[PDB]
Amino acid sequence: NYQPTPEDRFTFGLWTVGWQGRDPFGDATRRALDPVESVRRLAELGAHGVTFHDDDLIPFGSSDSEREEHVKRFRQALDDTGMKVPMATTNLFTHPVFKDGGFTANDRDVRRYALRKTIRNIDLAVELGAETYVAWGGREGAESGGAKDVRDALDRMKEAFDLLGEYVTSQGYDIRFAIEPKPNEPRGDILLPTVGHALAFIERLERPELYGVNPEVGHEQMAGLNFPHGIAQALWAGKLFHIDLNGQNGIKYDQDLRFGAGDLRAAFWLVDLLESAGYSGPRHFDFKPPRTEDFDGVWASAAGCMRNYLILKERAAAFRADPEVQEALRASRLDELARPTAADGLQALLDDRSAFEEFDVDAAAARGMAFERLDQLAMDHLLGAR
Amino acid sequence: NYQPTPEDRFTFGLWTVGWQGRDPFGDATRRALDPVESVRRLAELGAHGVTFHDDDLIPFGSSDSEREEHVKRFRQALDDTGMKVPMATTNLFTHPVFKDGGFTANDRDVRRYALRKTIRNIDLAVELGAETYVAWGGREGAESGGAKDVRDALDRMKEAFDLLGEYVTSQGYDIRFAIEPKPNEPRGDILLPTVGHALAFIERLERPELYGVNPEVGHEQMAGLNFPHGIAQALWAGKLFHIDLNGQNGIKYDQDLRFGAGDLRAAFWLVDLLESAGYSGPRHFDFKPPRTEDFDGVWASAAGCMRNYLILKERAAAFRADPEVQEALRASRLDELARPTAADGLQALLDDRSAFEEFDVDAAAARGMAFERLDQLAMDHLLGAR
Amino acid sequence: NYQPTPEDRFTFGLWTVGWQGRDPFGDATRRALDPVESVRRLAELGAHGVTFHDDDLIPFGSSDSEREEHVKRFRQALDDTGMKVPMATTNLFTHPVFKDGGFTANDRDVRRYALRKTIRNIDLAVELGAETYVAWGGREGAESGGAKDVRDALDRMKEAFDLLGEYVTSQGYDIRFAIEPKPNEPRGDILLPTVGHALAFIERLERPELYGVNPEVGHEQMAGLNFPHGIAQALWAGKLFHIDLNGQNGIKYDQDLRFGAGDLRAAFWLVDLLESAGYSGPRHFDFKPPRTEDFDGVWASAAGCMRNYLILKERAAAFRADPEVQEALRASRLDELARPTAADGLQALLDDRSAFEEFDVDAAAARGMAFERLDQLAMDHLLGAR
Amino acid sequence: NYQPTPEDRFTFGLWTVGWQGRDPFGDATRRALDPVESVRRLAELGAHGVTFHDDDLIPFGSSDSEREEHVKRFRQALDDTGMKVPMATTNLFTHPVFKDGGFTANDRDVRRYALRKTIRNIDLAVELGAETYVAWGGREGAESGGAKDVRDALDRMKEAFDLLGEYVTSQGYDIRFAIEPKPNEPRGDILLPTVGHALAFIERLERPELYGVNPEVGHEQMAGLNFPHGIAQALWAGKLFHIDLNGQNGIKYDQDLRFGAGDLRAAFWLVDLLESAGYSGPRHFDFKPPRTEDFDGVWASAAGCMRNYLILKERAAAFRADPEVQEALRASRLDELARPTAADGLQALLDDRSAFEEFDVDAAAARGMAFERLDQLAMDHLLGAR
Numbered sequence A, B, C, D: 001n002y003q004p005t006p007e008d009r010f011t012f013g014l015w016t017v018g019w020q021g022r023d024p025f026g027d028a029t030r031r032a033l034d035p036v037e038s039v040r041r042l043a044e045l046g047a048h049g050v051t052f053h054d055d056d057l058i059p060f061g062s063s064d065s066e067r068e069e070h071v072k073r074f075r076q077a078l079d080d081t082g083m084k085v086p087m088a089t090t091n092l093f094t095h096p097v098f099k100d101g102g103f104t105a106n107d108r109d110v111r112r113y114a115l116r117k118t119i120r121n122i123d124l125a126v127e128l129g130a131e132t133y134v135a136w137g138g139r140e141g142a143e144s145g146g147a148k149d150v151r152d153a154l155d156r157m158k159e160a161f162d163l164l165g166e167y168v169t170s171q172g173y174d175i176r177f178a179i180e181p182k183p184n185e186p187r188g189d190i191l192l193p194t195v196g197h198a199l200a201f202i203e204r205l206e207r208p209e210l211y212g213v214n215p216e217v218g219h220e221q222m223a224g225l226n227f228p229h230g231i232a233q234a235l236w237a238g239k240l241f242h243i244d245l246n247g248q249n250g251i252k253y254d255q256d257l258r259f260g261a262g263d264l265r266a267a268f269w270l271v272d273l274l275e276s277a278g279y280s281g282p283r284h285f286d287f288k289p290p291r292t293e294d295f296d297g298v299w300a301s302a303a304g305c306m307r308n309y310l311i312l313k314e315r316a317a318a319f320r321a322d323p324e325v326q327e328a329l330r331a332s333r334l335d336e337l338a339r340p341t342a343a344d345g346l347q348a349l350l351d352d353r354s355a356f357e358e359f360d361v362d363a364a365a366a367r368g369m370a371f372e373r374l375d376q377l378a379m380d381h382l383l384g385a386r
């Protein structure tokens, strides 16, 4: 009954089930979790692996000896459980030194520090077997217009990512970078605010093949955008390296609800797309168990992430396999959308009188698209009414 | 007193001052304008030129003889006034045949018709001297998830733009394309919904140098995004070919208010950016005089577009020239943002102990950014309190 | 299998299935429906009744003889089908005379005309058996700040509704008024923009008992508000006289999707609330079949409205009847929420040392609310996974 | 030059300039301010007074002896500076015990504790001379639909406010309550989310005359609503007891920018309304100096709040005094909006053939409203171009 196994590739950040519940108006409601306990409890729930920021695993300001001790404890728990570490990232947002950003801070010495802190954790990530290194520039942005020249900031952002790309290639590391966009919060506006802006920025880097995107459900929905559409564009570009799954109720602060909460139909179409396209990376949950919950509610919330993915996977597969749905897809001409508009070429199109001079515009206009019947079949499948 | 002249390059679409006021809940409140009158009245207001959709100038379904007559009347008014036509575009959204899109309609014969209708108007645009050809795919999208496979739709969109690029290069035309993004309306979600998505898509075309963006103030604000930030990214990529200026009050239907209305401070920072960067293209207003207005209010609204641009231009220039502002920009380290993070290179950065091992993180963290003082100087300049 | 019958009280506006598909960017895609055909087709689908604006039934500017003919044809179709007319309303938004509003137009003669047009249709509504008369002030508002003094406009709005209340009581009519809020569109901002503002306004009328609200799913969601919460407040006040059911995908133009589309989980909690509270009025669909559809898609879309209500009704009933859910509701202390905080009174509360001086604040703080487990049980029931 | 004096009645919360800069993603960037220093520094800037939560002034868990010491220190600083305390409020949101609310927590013992904590601070507020007691129910709400029965929660909310009203009247206190709405954050949805919902709720309390609203600029804008319109409705109802001034850039997390930032034109129309209506209460700033700033930037930001109010006050007064604006107001028939629609009464309106049978609907429809000219005069005045 919708039981996850490690083969489903479900992963969780240490900072997710470990969120203590401190929000901008309230103190923590839960004690801190030891990373080792989190690994053990997630393994028992059926997770495949965990992810981390450097500062989740090694407390900021630790000596090199305490650092080695923290990593050894962690690696032992991974060995004991069989859990993997597919992705790692850098905390460039919590410490007050990053209050105006890391890679695009106005202060040059902070930008250099940001790069050195990142490079140190890339080495550790590689040692733990991570294949993707995520960058979320949560402090790269501004509250006011004159504080940040955005062209200069983009030069600095490109400079930082180019240097990281030079570092991994000169070390011979087999790791790729994924940029995680977010439109706002904690800065008034954040640079590279959507999947689109991130994809466009990647094409201006020196080695674009090393960089993709790590889109998050809730972040694109904070701009009112269609998350499955944005994922489709990322797949079309060959840039979907990783994904952050959660839920969000509309345009407001980043809620990070468990996956399946928030916009349920968008979650259905997302799963349909990921499974149809054969996305093979981790199904990573970046979520926060609400601060109303005790530790029992934390693990119930984490289990619900995986359960909802598996239910939606079943419903989307039943939808696509239903002969009546396949007939409706042809009724709505989805098959024609997949055929080239003009494989005969430009000159033949120009000479084709059935394309313009003799095109019956009123007869084509009268054809219904039959989209509402198709969408109700999708609703029936989602709700288990078929 | 803030009087425009043709040298300011202010342009208007025929469909703007010509909007009859029909909205989804109401009949037209104004009679149709003859395009010739619009050209004459705009010339008297100080405009530089006009833009058009094919169907604004030539009524849909006109014979080739009526078509020639409509163009000749138009060209005579241009000659009489000295007005230019810097941009043209295609109507691929009003006729019911385009109800599921033009370039990405599920029906293949509609997609071919869409291309032939576009190519016919590219010829006319070139004949009238237009340098930019805009494409707004307002019907390319969906209300429901199963109606549109977005990867196939993007293949079709790329196919269409590649064919248009092949057409202009084989004809030897000196015209470039600009894609105008919009997140939604009239479709539930529109493909390429923001500047970012459009910029990323352009990099996958066969001849990317032929294509840029035509961002619109209100459209990016319908996604809650920072319009000056998005323009900065378009300039950074070298893709700001044209711009649509207007006003918008937040996340709601596309209001198309006169420029300066809506988000006034965003308008200030936009003008500051366009003038600082030396944008040399048309300052094009895509706006709708509210349907409360008679024809006197139409021309008052059009005049206000240009007036507000010129006032904001003066205030932004005074801001940047103020020695106290220049001092505050250095206080906030905008000069340091423009300097390379690591021109000494990767190895020197790795060997630089002042970048990490000996970096005083508490002293850097205590430095204030002085952004609020800078922003209040900007406010004082905008309001004329300095 | 989820078949509606007239006993389910499903009703539709004539303007819904009759929407021809004209939007702000496109011509109609469907021919006009005769109101008589709409009544017949809806009766065959299982609807209970229809609603109308005056101008849906009697074309604007009809003579008194044509008017009588239109009503007689309509009444014959009602007699032939058994369909009821539970609600009627006035079109105070389509004609250009209403461009600045009806009840709050700046021009006094327009406000008087608006009242006379309304009163004429109240007489007809009563003759057809309507129990609720809806007012949607879609043109009452402004695009700019100086155009409308809102205190004066509210005086005029109160004056209009007071006069309507005097009219129905002096005629001895058994009809009540329902105000339908909407935050924006077609005006930049609309007066009484949410359920809350409407409820507050009603308390200042001379006869508040005659007035309630007609909330619409999509309208509250255009302000990012929680529609079931707003309905709960309307029920708590005893003011839910009527309801408009449809779907909406977030903060954007008013989509009027079929009910169940848009925010599916909000639709579930709405149905749960309406059925639990014993709301006995019409389940009215104010929706627009998308303009992609032909007439077959129109009736498929209307049928889907009713189907989705009935599926959600079944799932909500199963949720509330599940013993495991009843146990979880007690685990989350929903039973304690329903018990008075201080039925012992103020003085006993002040003397209760267990309420403050001896209250163990750390022990109460450690109690988990168990909300995530409860919400996953609700998800399982919605998806038919239990 | 726009210098505030105590006669302008500018007030600040202790928690505003005292905000240490901890946000959901970052540690504090500023040390804590002693309340006594804040009073002294604000007095030097020209403020009139300060406001406080109980927990701002007396650290949570203080003994009665430490409590007396904290109040005495505070009162001495008030005496030394001449600063007043016009408003006080309760912190019912920071401590983990309030994680599911205070007045509407599911746990009954928490609701009783919430009432006792409030009543204790009402006594202190009265002792310090406060005239208004604000309640912001920031934790009253839910992230999921089944967690909170909203009708029961509203019963509990009414019960709490009724008990507070009984307490102040039995003590003979001359203090009134103001409810501060907010739509979301930190809860997914907050009860009484807008001015409208709060106004409607007040009419169901046992002693409605004791309760009004404390609207906040940014909170109504988090729902995309027109803040001056909402203030106008609060004034129309006689319920504007207090106001929170700040700035907000659209629909996103609560930014609490300094007043004048965010939506500048809305700030202009707000000041125009408050001054025209003769609002005589405190001009209270609930803002957060961005965490980029050091203490010099904190006081620059606080000074900017007051400066921007005074500049906008001057521009709005010049607008209303300009003879050309007065002429334009009559051109747009603002004078007619203020005249009764039907002072002649219902029967005379029914008998008035010029109101319907002989009303020239086409001639009235052709009249322009001249709103765009009026709005450009308002723009010219705001920018100092007239």
Ligand SMILES: OC[C@H]1O[C@H](O)[C@H](O)[C@@H](O)[C@@H]1O
Residues within 6 Å of the ligand: A015, A089, A134, A135, A136, A138, A180, A216, A244, A286
């Ligand atoms: O970059 C890794 C993570 O860092 C922070 O926790 C962000 O809140 C999250 O969105 C991001 O995915």
Ligand SMILES: OC[C@H]1O[C@H](O)[C@H](O)[C@@H](O)[C@@H]1O
Residues within 6 Å of the ligand: B015, B089, B134, B135, B136, B138, B180, B216, B244, B286
């Ligand atoms: O593409 C040219 C224009 O076409 C339509 O009028 C759109 O509404 C406008 O946004 C666009 O700029």
Ligand SMILES: OC[C@H]1O[C@H](O)[C@H](O)[C@@H](O)[C@@H]1O
Residues within 6 Å of the ligand: C015, C089, C134, C135, C136, C138, C180, C216, C244, C286
């Ligand atoms: O008032 C009845 C109806 O009138 C209009 O059709 C509105 O768009 C709809 O929202 C409203 O319910």
Ligand SMILES: OC[C@H]1O[C@H](O)[C@H](O)[C@@H](O)[C@@H]1O
Residues within 6 Å of the ligand: D015, D089, D134, D135, D136, D138, D180, D216, D244, D286
């Ligand atoms: O109630 C007083 C204040 O409490 C909290 O600080 C809120 O964030 C603020 O909005 C409110 O005004």
Ligand SMILES: [Mg+2]
Residues within 6 Å of the ligand: A216, A219, A254, A256, A286
């Ligand atoms: Mg996130």
Ligand SMILES: [Mg+2]
Residues within 6 Å of the ligand: A216, A218, A219, A254, A255, A256, A286
């Ligand atoms: Mg997030």
Ligand SMILES: [Mg+2]
Residues within 6 Å of the ligand: A180, A216, A244, A286
């Ligand atoms: Mg994330």
Ligand SMILES: [Mg+2]
Residues within 6 Å of the ligand: B216, B219, B254, B256, B286
């Ligand atoms: Mg537009």
Ligand SMILES: [Mg+2]
Residues within 6 Å of the ligand: B216, B218, B219, B254, B255, B256, B286
């Ligand atoms: Mg627009």
Ligand SMILES: [Mg+2]
Residues within 6 Å of the ligand: B180, B216, B244, B286
């Ligand atoms: Mg445009």
Ligand SMILES: [Mg+2]
Residues within 6 Å of the ligand: C216, C219, C254, C256, C286
């Ligand atoms: Mg509606």
Ligand SMILES: [Mg+2]
Residues within 6 Å of the ligand: C216, C218, C219, C254, C255, C256, C286
């Ligand atoms: Mg609607």
Ligand SMILES: [Mg+2]
Residues within 6 Å of the ligand: C180, C216, C244, C286
């Ligand atoms: Mg409606």
Ligand SMILES: [Mg+2]
Residues within 6 Å of the ligand: D216, D219, D254, D256, D286
């Ligand atoms: Mg606030």
Ligand SMILES: [Mg+2]
Residues within 6 Å of the ligand: D216, D218, D219, D254, D255, D256, D286
């Ligand atoms: Mg706030």
Ligand SMILES: [Mg+2]
Residues within 6 Å of the ligand: D180, D216, D244, D286
């Ligand atoms: Mg406040």
